[PDB]
């Protein structure tokens, strides 16, 4: 149940070097070349991005390297970019078919471009209107930071109930990515002119509007 | 990933779960060298079983690995709160090349088990009118919080352009997540449909959605 030793985090902005060391004993990390780095987003699968120490599985950017030193092993990131903020897992073998995992250390990338949101609003479908259901979709996706409020309208009114909204999460494009969701009847949808989803981002606004179809 | 191993599996205190990870003649089937690894999220994981059978010193015997053929299995009997987490299946292959499992979220069910209500939205106007044909497939009301989104164009498993969000739990002390495809407006009228797969708890719901003449 011993942990190898990594700091608990470490940051750079953009273009930055970041070294993060992973401290053993001379029966793990000093005994062998069996060293191992991991990367992990949040709530996503681990990636290789180190094995044996120094070497870079297919698919891993030049800009990962690793060494060892004694008893510590190092991962350097240069030329951080976006999609470098992660938790970063060292692992050695050792005697006794053991593999040691250190405890991660959190990388931040500073300064991140700020992002205002893509909005689409979506009127209920023909298939759900047809199982008597009325459920309107506002897609949020590509802001930075992963931060939004939501407010709906039927027509020029607050909407104070049916409200559900997602907790952002980060997605591929390294931007944060939610939805929110209003609950109608068919009745609700077609009794009103319009419904609104009004998305606030860093106290700037947008607002999308949609109507019953005329098709 | 390499080696397939189920995307979920629950149970309740005291149950067994069996998880499996499957992959070829050339890696699982080929030697005695598959490791399980246990990952509590935003943790450092822990090996809990390696050489198919073998429990690391403090593991409980809960944990039993066993292998037949291609597929290896973990069993965790009796259930408890604390084995709530990721399993990670490995197998070295042919190159000494070491395999990774996608990695099973194994829940112990802390509330009733709900199948997902999925709602798939074609492109709007406003969208489309703007050049995206973005679709959404709205998933909510589910438990456990563990869900894989696939999407088809007619029949064709499409990987570019699709994001699903991290299931979040919502008022109801259920999980809701969208997953988005972001299609261009030639793409989405060029085809005769795109659909949106939904799996939960081993069960998979299939929507349907194809251009209109008038939106
Ligand atoms: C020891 C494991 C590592 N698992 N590795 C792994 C797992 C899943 C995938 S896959 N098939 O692409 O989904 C790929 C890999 N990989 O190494 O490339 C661990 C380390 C750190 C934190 C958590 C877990």
């Known amino acids: 149940q011993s942990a190898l030793t990594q700091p608990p985090s470490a940051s750079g902005s953009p273009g930055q070097s970041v070294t993060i060391s992973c401290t053993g004993t001379?029966?793990?990390?000093?005994?062998?070349?069996?060293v191992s780095w991991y990367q992990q987003h949040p709530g996503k699968a681990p990636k290789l991005i180190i094995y044996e120490v120094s070497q870079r599985p297919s698919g891993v950017p030049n800009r990962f390297s690793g060494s060892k030193s004694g008893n510590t092993a190092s991962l350097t990131v240069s030329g951080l970019q976006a999609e470098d903020d992660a938790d970063?897992?060292?692992?050695?073998?050792?005697?006794?078919?053991?593999?040691?995992?250190?405890?991660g250390t959190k990388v931040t990338v500073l300064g991140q471009p700020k992002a205002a949101p893509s909005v689409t609003l979506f009127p209920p479908s023909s298939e759900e209107l047809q199982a008597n259901k009325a459920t309107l979709v506002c897609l949020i996706s590509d802001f930075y930071p992963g931060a939004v409020t939501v407010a709906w309208k039927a027509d020029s009114s607050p909407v104070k109930a049916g409200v559900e909204t997602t907790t952002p999460s980060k997605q591929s494009n390294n931007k944060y990515a939610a939805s929110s969701y209003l609950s109608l009847t068919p009745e609700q949808w077609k009794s009103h002119r319009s419904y609104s989803c009004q998305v606030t981002h860093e106290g700037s606004t947008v607002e999308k509007t949609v109507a019953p179809t005329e098709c | 990933s390499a080696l397939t191993q189920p995307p979920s599996a629950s149970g309740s205190p005291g149950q067994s779960v069996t998880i499996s990870c499957?992959?070829?003649?050339?890696?699982?089937?080929?030697?005695?060298?598959?490791?399980?690894y246990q990952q509590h999220p935003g943790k450092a994981p822990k090996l809990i079983i390696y050489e198919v059978s073998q429990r690391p010193s403090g593991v409980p015997n809960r944990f039993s690995g066993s292998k037949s053929g291609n597929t290896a299995s973990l069993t965790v009997s009796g259930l408890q709160a604390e084995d709530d987490a990721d399993?990670?299946?490995?197998?070295?292959?042919?190159?000494?090349?070491?395999?990774?499992?996608?990695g099973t979220k194994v829940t112990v069910l802390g509330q009733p088990k709900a199948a997902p209500s999925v709602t798939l939205f074609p492109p709007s106007s406003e969208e489309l009118q703007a050049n995206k044909a973005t679709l959404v497939c709205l998933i909510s009301d589910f438990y456990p919080g563990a869900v894989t989104v696939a999407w088809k164009a007619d029949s064709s498993p499409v990987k570019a352009g699709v994001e699903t969000t991290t299931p979040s739990k919502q008022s109801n002390n259920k999980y809701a997540a969208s997953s988005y495809l972001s299609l261009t407006p030639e793409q989405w009228k060029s085809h005769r449909s795109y659909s949106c797969q939904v799996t939960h708890e081993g069960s998979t719901v299939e929507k349907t959605v194809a251009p209109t003449e008038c939106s």
């Open positions: 490995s197998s070295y292959g042919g190159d000494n090349n070491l395999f």
């Open positions: 001379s029966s793990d990390v000093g005994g062998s070349d069996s």
């Open positions: 692992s050695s073998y050792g005697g006794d078919n053991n593999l040691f």
